[PDB]
Design an enzyme around this catalytic site. Structure first.
Site, PDB file in Angstrom:
ATOM      1  N   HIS A 139      48.416  50.741  39.294  1.00  0.00           N
ATOM      2  CA  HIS A 139      47.304  50.842  40.238  1.00  0.00           C
ATOM      3  C   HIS A 139      46.333  51.951  39.863  1.00  0.00           C
ATOM      4  O   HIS A 139      45.111  51.766  39.904  1.00  0.00           O
ATOM      5  CB  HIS A 139      47.820  51.085  41.655  1.00  0.00           C
ATOM      6  CG  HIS A 139      46.745  50.992  42.687  1.00  0.00           C
ATOM      7  ND1 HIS A 139      46.002  49.848  42.873  1.00  0.00           N
ATOM      8  CD2 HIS A 139      46.264  51.904  43.567  1.00  0.00           C
ATOM      9  CE1 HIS A 139      45.113  50.059  43.830  1.00  0.00           C
ATOM     10  NE2 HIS A 139      45.261  51.293  44.276  1.00  0.00           N
TER      11      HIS A 139
ATOM     12  N   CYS B 141      40.154  50.436  44.720  1.00  0.00           N
ATOM     13  CA  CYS B 141      41.253  50.278  45.691  1.00  0.00           C
ATOM     14  C   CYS B 141      40.651  49.715  46.978  1.00  0.00           C
ATOM     15  O   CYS B 141      39.967  48.685  46.919  1.00  0.00           O
ATOM     16  CB  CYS B 141      41.969  51.626  45.825  1.00  0.00           C
ATOM     17  SG  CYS B 141      43.388  51.638  46.976  1.00  0.00           S
TER      18      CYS B 141
ATOM     19  N   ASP C 241      49.964  46.177  38.516  1.00  0.00           N
ATOM     20  CA  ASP C 241      49.716  46.823  39.797  1.00  0.00           C
ATOM     21  C   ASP C 241      50.786  46.387  40.787  1.00  0.00           C
ATOM     22  O   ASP C 241      50.878  45.206  41.137  1.00  0.00           O
ATOM     23  CB  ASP C 241      48.324  46.499  40.333  1.00  0.00           C
ATOM     24  CG  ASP C 241      47.862  47.507  41.368  1.00  0.00           C
ATOM     25  OD1 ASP C 241      48.734  48.128  42.018  1.00  0.00           O
ATOM     26  OD2 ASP C 241      46.637  47.702  41.517  1.00  0.00           O
TER      27      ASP C 241
END
Ligand code: NA
Ligand code: NA
Ligand code: NA
Ligand code: NA
Lengths: 289, 289
Positions: free
Chosen positions: B264, B110, B235
């Site tokens: 995600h 991330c 995502d």
């Protein structure tokens, strides 16, 4: 009125020092930022004096690590931090009773114009911004980025062991110029020729931080803060094409003045009265005075 | 082997704290960076255990202002600085006598994937880099930047006056989401639901710094360092399209792994063994173990 020595504190705990040129009565104000790796001492004071004589209170200060200001390492340039410090300067300046807080403008020459535009991108307390011959790109040839980045990694690790910070000269003893340093190496002999002292060293970390700094990525956020660019037509030190590219990325309201026939510095020998009257008119129209 | 508490000093004077997952012998190493505003404690520790069991010593630490590490304000995200701290982490791994200095790889999830790609762009001591679902852009609606930038300006002035740093919630009281906080507000209830503690506050200065941070400015500099992007196909938190656009800005040697039919974070319920096996295979091919 005479100039005053002043200092103010930054969010990250530094004392920056400079000169205040007070106008004769409450009114507009201007924070002036100098060129690449330069203190406040050269060229700008006489321009501050001219603005002061036209009713604008001017603050001229040494950026972090330069001149009389705090900061370590010295001569270690960080555009992001310097823009942040201009927000702290605006905060300080607003407390002066000679300063109308709706008439605080930013003005910058060369690298100072890059930092000026970035600060105007973020700080809507600024009423207007002027960039004179702004330095837009320090990348140089990106295929000589590798040695200086390796030096930056070695510099970190060596300082972690208590070594002094590593510096690059504007010109190596063999006559070479380090990758992102041609503007510096070009300006230094002309400045020193005119009796202006030049610190001919810059931290290797300066190049590291500039790779992550791209003024073209934030100048679209200046609007609606009025912004003026002043671009010498024949600037080969801060390429005129680069400056106009930056202007093209900005939004309205934005205004451009081309200094016909002039390079990066030699406009100081031209009709500077007319150059400054134009900028004064810009400030009068947009800050209303 | 058991995991050890470790800490290391940054160039700018902070102590970052983490865990070490030593392999049973000298070998490859991996520095692991967590997601947006998250401590080391979530998800990454078990991934580190897996890499440790496959012979890779892992460092997992809290970024500046997070968890057990130093930093003020807390939860104040600065990608440029966190990449710099990854350089100091590489130095710590090199300088300590446990790992093979030529087999130090970076791994990030991330926002950690963003910082990982940035660090790999600058630090050629890194042998390889893996970015999992990297967060590419936090600008949000750029027409919504004004209220946050104004709060950032006000936070600066208030903190100078002695006041405490200003923080924003992931979710305002009227149920609205601040501008660059849609990923965070989406991921928080999911992690808390699983008992993972979530700091639901972010410094207003986080948005200020991020506007001058654009990972696409530097990812073309990663090569020749082998880089692997692992992108969930669906995502919606960090748009798959942003991630692929970043990957196309990168040069060879690079490798892309699409996690088909995964979002995600919900790939953590899928075949993670095969996910990590493809990353281990990537490392084996480029770090010769
Ligand atoms: Na730059
Ligand atoms: Na002109
Ligand atoms: Na005050
Ligand atoms: Na950004």
């Amino acid at each position: 009125l005479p100039r005053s020595d002043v200092e103010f504190t930054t969010l990250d705990g530094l004392t920056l020092r400079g000169w205040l040129f007070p106008a004769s009565q409450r009114g507009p104000a201007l924070i002036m930022s100098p060129g690449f790796n330069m203190p406040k001492d050269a060229i700008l004071p006489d321009i501050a004096k001219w603005f002061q004589e036209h009713g604008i209170t001017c603050l001229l200060y040494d950026p972090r690590g330069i001149g009389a200001s705090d900061g370590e390492p010295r001569n270690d340039i960080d555009a992001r931090q310097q823009a942040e410090h201009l927000h702290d300067a605006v905060t300080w300046f607003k407390e002066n009773p000679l300063v109308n807080e709706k008439q605080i403008a930013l003005w910058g020459l060369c690298f100072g114009g890059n930092v000026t535009l970035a600060a105007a991108a973020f700080d809507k307390r600024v009423a207007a911004a002027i960039a004179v011959a702004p330095l837009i790109d320090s990348t140089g040839n990106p295929e000589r980025r590798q040695p200086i980045l390796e030096l930056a990694m070695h510099d970190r690790a060596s300082r972690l062991d208590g070594e002094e910070p590593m510096y690059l000269p504007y010109v190596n003893e063999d006559g070479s110029i380090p990758n992102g340093l041609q503007l510096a190496a070009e300006m230094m002999p002309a400045l020193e020729r005119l009796g202006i002292p030049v610190e001919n060293r810059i931290s290797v970390q300066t190049y590291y931080k500039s790779l992550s700094w791209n003024i073209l990525n934030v100048v679209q956020y200046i609007s609606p803060t009025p912004a003026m660019m002043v671009t010498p037509e024949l600037d080969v030190s801060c390429p005129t094409e680069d400056q106009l590219n930056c202007f093209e990325h900005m939004k309205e309201p934005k205004e451009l003045d081309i200094l016909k026939g002039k390079g990066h510095l030699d406009w100081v020998f031209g009709d500077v009265e007319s150059i400054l009257n134009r900028q004064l008119d810009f400030l009068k129209r947009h800050m209303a005075f």
